[PDB]
Amino acid sequence: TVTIKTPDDIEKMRIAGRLAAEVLEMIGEHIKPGVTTEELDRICHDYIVNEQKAIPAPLNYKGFPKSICTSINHVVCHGIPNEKPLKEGDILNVDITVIKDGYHGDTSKMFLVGKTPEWADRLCQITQECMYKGISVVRPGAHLGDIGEIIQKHAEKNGFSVVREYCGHGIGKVFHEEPQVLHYGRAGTGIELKEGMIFTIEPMINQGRPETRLLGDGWTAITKDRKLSAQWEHTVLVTADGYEILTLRNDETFPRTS
Amino acid sequence: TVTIKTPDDIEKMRIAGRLAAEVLEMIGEHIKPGVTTEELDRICHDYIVNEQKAIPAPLNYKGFPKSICTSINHVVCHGIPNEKPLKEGDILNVDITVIKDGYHGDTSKMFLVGKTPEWADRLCQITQECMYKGISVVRPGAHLGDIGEIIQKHAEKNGFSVVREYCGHGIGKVFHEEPQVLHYGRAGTGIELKEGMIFTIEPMINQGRPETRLLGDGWTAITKDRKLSAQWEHTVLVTADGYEILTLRNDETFPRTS
Amino acid sequence: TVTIKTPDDIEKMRIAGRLAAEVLEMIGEHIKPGVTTEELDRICHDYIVNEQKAIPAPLNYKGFPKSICTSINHVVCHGIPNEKPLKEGDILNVDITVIKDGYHGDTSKMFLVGKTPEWADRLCQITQECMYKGISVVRPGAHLGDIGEIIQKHAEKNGFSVVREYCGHGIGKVFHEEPQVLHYGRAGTGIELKEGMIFTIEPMINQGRPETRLLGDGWTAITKDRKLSAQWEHTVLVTADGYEILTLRNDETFPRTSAA
Amino acid sequence: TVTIKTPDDIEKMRIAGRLAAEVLEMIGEHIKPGVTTEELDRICHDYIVNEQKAIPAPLNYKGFPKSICTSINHVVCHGIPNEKPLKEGDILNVDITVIKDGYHGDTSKMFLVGKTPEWADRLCQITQECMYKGISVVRPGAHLGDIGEIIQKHAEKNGFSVVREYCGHGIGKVFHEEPQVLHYGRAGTGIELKEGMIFTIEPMINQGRPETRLLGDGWTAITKDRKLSAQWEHTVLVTADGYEILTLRNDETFPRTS
Ligand SMILES: [Mn+2]
Ligand SMILES: [Mn+2]
Ligand SMILES: [Mn+2]
Ligand SMILES: [Mn+2]
Ligand SMILES: [Mn+2]
Ligand SMILES: [Mn+2]
Ligand SMILES: [Mn+2]
Ligand SMILES: [Mn+2]
C-alpha cells in the first residue's frame, strides 16, 4: 500500500522543499558560455553542506559518483557532470535533491544559453505548460490515469511525443517509494487518491519519435533519432479539497494552492 | 439543451447585472429597528421604475403579489412583505431581480439588525464562504458536480446542514431556463461547462437538521425544527479561461474575474 | 429560488415499491400456529388483484406455479405454498414482487411463530444487520466489491457462513437484468456505481456450513448439513450524493436516505 | 330551508315505503355460501320492474352502474355487485331505494352467511339498538343534535366508534335534499323539528378506529385499520304526537308509531 503522512511529518517536508527551491534560485547567476558542468557541481555541493547545514541525496546512491545531474541537447536524463564547457546555442536541465534531518525534497528547471533556434524555445515552453495541467487535476477521489491523459493530449496537439521508459514516484523518509506515476494513459484507470499522500510529477517530452538508448557509462540516456528532449519537475501534497506545491520559486506566477 | 450567448447578448447582460447590484447598495442605508417590510418594498419599486427606467421581475409572476422577497430568522425562502416592524436582534435576506430592455439580472444578501448574538453571526459568515468556494472552481472543461461537492464539504465539517429541494438555474432573455444547479453532490459528475453559458449560485444552509415545510398561504417555507437558516446569491458567466461575476458590489473585497 | 424536478420513470418506480411494502404490513396480522402456506398465498393474491388494481410477478414466470414464495427452517430459498400447517417454534420467510403499469418492486422479511428458541432469534438478528451494512456504502464512485466485503466480514466474525451460488440483480421495466450482486468479495473490484442505477440487496446466511442442494421438484433448495438458514431483501436507488430505499415499511427504524 | 309535505304527498310516500320493505323480505331466502353479488342484483331488478310496476333509483345515478349496493366485512358503504362468491363466516349489508309514480322510499339491513364468530354477531346487534334509540327522540319541538348525542353515547360505552365523513338526508319527490343528519353531537343544537318533515337515520359503526379510505374505482370505501364495520337504515315522518316509521317490515317487534 501507499504511505499516509501525519501533521508533524507535513511540517518537516515544507522545510526540505523550500531549501531545494533556494539552490535553483542561487545557481542562475553562474550559467554562461565557457563554464564547465563539474564547476557547477562544486558550487551547489559547498552551498548545501556549509550554508544550509543539509546533505545532497544523489552522492553515492546506488553507486552514482556526483552531487547533481546535468543533461544537454539530445540527452533525456541522468547526465554526469564533467570537464566540457557550455557553448552558444545549448539547452540545459539542472536536477536537485536535498535531505534535511531525514526528510527529502526533489525539483528541476530548463536554461537557454545565448542565441537558440526558435524550435528550441517553444519545445521548453510547451513542456512547462504540460506539468502545470497535470498538477491542476490532483484532489481526493481523482484517479492516477487522469494525470497521464491531460499531459499526452497537450503534447500531441503541438506535434511532439511522450517518453514511456522512465516515470515519477512517491517520496518522504526515503528517496523512492510506491506508486509509479506514468506521463501517458486513459482517464479513470489506476489507484484512487487520498488526503495526506506525497509524490513527484516530472514529464520528459521529445521533438521527434519516443524511443531511447543507453550509453557506455551505464547511466546516460539519449534520443534514438538524435533530435532534442526537455524536462521540468515539482514535489506535490494532496489536501482536503485539492493540491499544495512544496518546491515553488519566487520567480513563478502559477498559484501555490488551489 | 443549454443556450450559448453571442457577443451582443453579453454586453446587454453586463448592463442588467450592474443595475441589480445598485438596488442592494441603495437599500442598506434605510434598514434599522422599527421599519416595516412593506415600506422597504415601496422604496425599491419606485427606484427601479422612476430612476433606472426598468421593471421588477417578481411582480405578478405566477401570482406572486409584491416586487421583492423578504425572509426573516427561521424562514428559508419566498417571504411576503407586510405591516410588521423589524426588531433588535433579527437576521434578514433581501432577494432582487431587474428586467432592462428584455435581459434579466439576479442577486441577494444578509443584513444584521441592531445588536445580534454570536451564533447567528457564525452561520452568516460560513454561508458566504460556501458561495465564494463554488464560484472559484468555474472554467471550461469543469463539471456541475464540482460546485455541489466543494459547498457540502465546507458546511458539514463546520457542523451545519444543506437544503435539498430548492436550487439555482440558467438565466438570460427568460427568468428560469436549463440547467438545474444543485448545492450537494460528487466531483466530475453532471454536464460539462463551455464558454458563453450563464447561470446562478444561491446556497441555503441550516443551524439544525435539513428538512423544510410550506405554510397555509401557499408561498412561505420554514425549517421543520424552528432553528435559524441563511442565503447569499450571484449571476455568473463562463469565459475563455475562468469566471466573471456580473452582480459584484463596491463594498466587496473578493476579485471580479480569474 | 426554484423547486427541483423529477423524471417520469423515477416517480413510477416509487409507486411500485410503496405497494410491495404494504403487502408485508397486511399479511403479519394473519400469521400464527395452525394456518397453512396455501391459505397465505390466496389472501395475498386477492389483495394485489382486487384492491391494489395490480399483478403478482412470480405467477407463471419460467413455469413457477404460485403468486408468492414461502421458505421454512432448513429451506434456503424458492419454497412452494402447500397443504401443511405452521407449528409452534418455526422460523418463516415470505418473498413478494408487484407489477404496476409495467414497473417492478421486490422485497422479503422473517417472521417468528409463537415462542421461538434463543439460537434461532440470534441468526435472524445478525442477517438483518448484514443487509443494512451493505446499503450503507452505496453512492456515485463506489465499486460493486465494497458491498460483498462488508457483508462477509460481519457474518464470519460472529460465527456464521455465506451462501455463494445465489445473488441480487438489476430491476426496472423487467424482473431480472445486469449486474450480478455477489454477497462475498474484495473492496475496489468490479464496475463503478453511477446516479440513476436501480438493483437488489438479498443475503442468505447459514447456522453451520455453506453448501446447498436442489430437491426433485426442480425449485426448492436446502442446507446440506440440515441446520437452519435466514434471508432479508430491499430495492435500492443511487442518488446524486448517496442512497434511497424504495421498499421501506412504517415499522422499521433505519433511515430512508443518506441525508438523513 | 326545509320543505313541508301536504296530506296528499303523505299518502303517496306510504305506498313507496311499503314497496321498498317488501324487497328485503323476498331476497332473504336466496342468501347462502357460494352465490355471487351480481346474481342478487339481477333478482332484485326483475322483481321491482316486472312485478311492482316501479323503477330502481340507483341505476345510472351520477354514473353508478348497477340497481342495488352490496357491502362485505371491512367495506363501510357503496360496494358494487360483481363476480366474487360469498364465503361462510362473512357479514353483508343490502341497501335498496324504489321510485313509484315520482315518490322515493329508502332502507337497509344486515345478513349472517352460514356459521359466524360470536363477536361479529354482537357488533350487528349493538348497531341496530343505536338506530332505534335515535328514532325514539323525534317529535315537534326537538332539535337535530338530540339524535347525534344519544347514538354516540351507546356506541362508546360498548368500546366502538362513529364514522364522521358520511350522513343521513331529506327525501320526497327528489332522492337527496336538506337537512344534513349527523350521527354524533350535543343535545339542544341545530334546527328545530316541525310536523310534516320527512328524513333518513342510517348510522355506520366501526370495531376499531373511525377513519376511512377510498379505492381506485372511485366509489368503494374501507376502514383505514382493516377491522369490521356495520349499518342499518329507515325512512321517518314527524307527526302531531311523535313519529311514524314508513319502511317497517313484518318481522320487526319495535312499535310502528308513538
Ligand atoms: Mn524525481
Ligand atoms: Mn529529480
Ligand atoms: Mn474507482
Ligand atoms: Mn535534453
Ligand atoms: Mn432565514
Ligand atoms: Mn433571486
Ligand atoms: Mn470531462
Ligand atoms: Mn435565482
Ligand SMILES: [Mn+2]
Ligand atoms: Mn424477491
Ligand SMILES: [Mn+2]
Ligand atoms: Mn430479488
Ligand SMILES: [Mn+2]
Ligand atoms: Mn430457512
Ligand SMILES: [Mn+2]
Ligand atoms: Mn340507502
Ligand SMILES: [Mn+2]
Ligand atoms: Mn339514504
Ligand SMILES: [Mn+2]
Ligand atoms: Mn362492512
